[PDB]
């Protein structure tokens, strides 16, 4: 399905490629409906 | 999930709403109950058996 | 689902350190952001970096 | 050398004590920090560096990985820091170095410096004031709260003189001192009227909000003309090598018509016929430099020498509060000792201690006389606290209910004793007046919580995840339920016609994802909804009979 893996160094562009978004709070969750 | 909306619209049981985390014997043990002790919080008022 | 914080009983719960590592990074980050938005003495700016 | 005969005898023999490299250490290292980072730095060869004297099977056991290239490298390094004593990475230590070499002020050091922040922003109200349109949106801000839009004692802080009516008093003084200004231009007394204006505008008081606006509004209209003194320096003396001469006599001093660029087209130079380059270019920037002018009531080369008188005032207060930030690092190091180990790091708390310094010199008034050392103990005690309160533990806790567990904390602590062996939940409920409710979910909340490399232990080396379970998960005997209950549907429903089963395909969401309204399903056959629900009715009716519910009954847990 592969046949190789292949690695590399993650260009900044690719980081930002694999993102879904930007963490910019350290909160984890709601601490009251754990949210 | 559909095949649920349509057998339970049949027999017209609802959901639960509830579920059963309950306290059972595990697998194999057969034994013989010789105490039961219900410990309640005091907010709690108590219940029957307590 | 990598570094999880699941819901244990009575209340508790438990993660991974990881969770305490990113968050050591992102209160840096956003406290380095803002002292370059601040135009801070460059002492102060350079141990936070 | 002597590290590199403890380098060749630990790779004689094959190990290394705690005796050979403490007698293999020079002589000027001292603290326990940058030893046993060389002992990491032989210690990744590895030639094993052990407390005792090792066993006879674990130097043929333990192995020697890998020769030679990291052992180069390292010997690079190990040869290389028999030199400098200076060396560590830590930041607290290395920012007690830097932080040693700011001495501290005296009382009169620290209000002549106040004082130089003081007339640091007084050279750039100075710069501010010295502008016209700032002042013109002094007139359509007071007009616009005329009509209360904002609160103007809120938007200035009245001004410097608690009551409207006087800050009306000192904006009806503005109005009639513009009009014997503007009106009065046609330039003899002219400038001098701008003087008088700009005079009475340095003992208003405002919010620095209200300031920063105007700062900046014209600080875009600033870096523009910056932007077209690169618009012409970048296209004159590189482009077209336009010698800087004519750049420094014609341009320069006059900046304003069009002739010390487009009379410049016949000084019969290659640059001349050059400038046909760039002849189109500037005369956009012919018309928006003095456009500018049209949006100040003076030239562009006293707009050169206004932003200088703010740009370098700005650049002597911010670097004396500075000065007075930087002498007074001794003081934050000595509180975060006191907030050290309540959850954050001891860096951490000091850097949101020199954002509080930072804010505590802004809003510090020397005028009273105080000391300043009494003032940012106030803000310090604040922001510490505010940021172990906000970024301390992994679930943010906000900021009074964290004071709701401190006062509890503190409050228990002292009905441990003064009550007998413990205080109860219920007790709590009597010495605060939070009603036995409001007090219980205090101590339901956690505390930092449990980590999931948590030792059980001595099973497998097992942690704690491990033995945490997903339930959220599809557990293969109700998938395959599942999974055969969509196909015992397909053959109740291979029972049904055309019509009567489709329908109950799409009142569900039997392969298709929805799930119709009743008037939906009776949108598709045009029948008002009532026919569809009896139709429906009558297909449920029909599959509730026995052998017929045969395999369905079966699927239902009973």
């Not at chain 4, 409207?164 to 503007?182: C, D, G, S």
């Amino acid at each position: 399905e592969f046949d190789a893996i292949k690695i590399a160094l993650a260009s900044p562009d690719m980081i930002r490629s694999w993102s879904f978004g930007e963490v910019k709070k350290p909160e984890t969750i709601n601490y009251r409906t754990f949210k | 999930t559909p095949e649920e909306k349509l057998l339970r619209a049949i027999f017209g049981e609802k959901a639960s709403d509830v579920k059963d985390s309950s306290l059972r014997v595990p697998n194999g043990v057969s034994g013989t109950v010789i105490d039961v002790q219900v410990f309640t919080r005091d907010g709690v008022e108590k219940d029957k058996r307590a | 689902d990598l570094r999880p914080l699941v819901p244990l009983d009575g209340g508790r719960f438990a993660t991974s350190d990881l969770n305490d590592l990113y968050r050591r990074v992102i209160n840096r980050n956003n406290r380095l952001k803002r002292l370059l938005d601040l135009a801070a003495p460059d002492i102060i700016v350079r141990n936070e970096k | 050398s002597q590290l590199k005969l403890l380098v060749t005898r630990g790779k004689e023999q094959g190990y290394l004590t705690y005796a050979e490299v403490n007698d293999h250490l020079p002589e000027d290292i001292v603290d326990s920090d940058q030893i046993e980072d060389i002992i990491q730095m032989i210690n990744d060869m590895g030639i094993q560096v052990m407390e005792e004297a090792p066993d006879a099977d674990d130097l043929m056991l333990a192995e020697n990985t890998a020769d030679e290239d990291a052992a180069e490298a390292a010997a690079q390094v190990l040869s290389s820091v028999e030199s400098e004593i200076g060396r560590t990475t830590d930041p607290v230590r290395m920012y007690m170095r830097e932080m040693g070499t700011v001495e501290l002020l005296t009382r009169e050091g620290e209000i002549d410096i106040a004082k130089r922040i003081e007339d640091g922003i007084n050279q750039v109200q100075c710069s501010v004031a010295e502008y016209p349109e700032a002042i013109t949106y002094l007139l359509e801000q007071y007009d616009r709260v005329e009509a209360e839009e904002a609160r103007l004692s809120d938007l200035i802080t009245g001004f410097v003189d608690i009551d409207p009516e006087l800050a009306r008093e000192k904006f009806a003084e503005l109005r009639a001192q513009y009009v014997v200004t503007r009106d009065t231009i046609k330039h003899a007394t002219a400038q001098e009227e701008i003087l008088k204006l700009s005079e009475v505008f340095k003992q208003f008081r405002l919010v620095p909000k209200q300031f920063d606006y105007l700062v900046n509004s014209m600080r875009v209209m600033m870096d523009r003309v910056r932007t077209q003194e690169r618009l012409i320096m970048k296209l004159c003396v590189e482009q077209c090598k336009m010698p800087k001469k004519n750049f420094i006599t014609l341009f320069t001093g006059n900046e304003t018509s069009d002739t010390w660029f487009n009379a410049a087209i016949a000084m019969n130079k290659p640059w001349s016929e050059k400038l046909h380059d760039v002849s189109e270019e500037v005369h956009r920037a012919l018309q928006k430099l003095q456009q500018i002018e049209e949006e100040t009531g003076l030239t562009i080369e006293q707009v050169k020498d206004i932003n200088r008188r703010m740009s370098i005032g700005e650049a002597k207060a911010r670097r004396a509060k500075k000065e007075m930030v930087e002498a007074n690092l001794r003081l934050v190091i000595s509180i975060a000792k006191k907030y050290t180990n309540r959850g954050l790091q001891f860096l951490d708390l000091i850097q949101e201690g020199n954002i509080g310094l930072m804010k505590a010199v802004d809003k510090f008034e020397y005028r009273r006389g105080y000391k300043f050392s009494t003032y940012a103990t106030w803000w310090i005690r604040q922001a510490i606290t505010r940021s172990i309160a906000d970024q301390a533990r992994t679930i943010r806790i906000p900021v009074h209910m964290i004071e709701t567990i401190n006062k509890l904390n503190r409050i228990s602590r002292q009905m441990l004793q003064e009550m007998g062996r413990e205080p109860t939940p219920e007790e709590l409920a009597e010495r605060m007046l939070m009603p036995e409710d409001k007090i219980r979910k205090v101590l339901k909340i956690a505390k930092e919580p449990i980590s999931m490399e948590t030792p059980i232990g001595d099973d497998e080396d097992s942690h704690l995840g491990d033995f945490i379970e997903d339930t959220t998960l599809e557990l293969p005997l109700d998938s395959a339920t599942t999974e055969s209950l969509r196909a015992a549907t397909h053959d109740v429903l291979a029972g049904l016609t055309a019509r009567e089963a489709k329908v109950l395909r799409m009142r569900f969401g039997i392969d298709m994802n929805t799930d119709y309204t009743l008037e939906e399903v009776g949108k598709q056959f045009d029948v008002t909804r009532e026919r569809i629900r009896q139709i429906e009715a009558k297909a449920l009716r029909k599959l509730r009979h026995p052998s017929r519910s045969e395999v369905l009954r079966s699927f239902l847990d009973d």
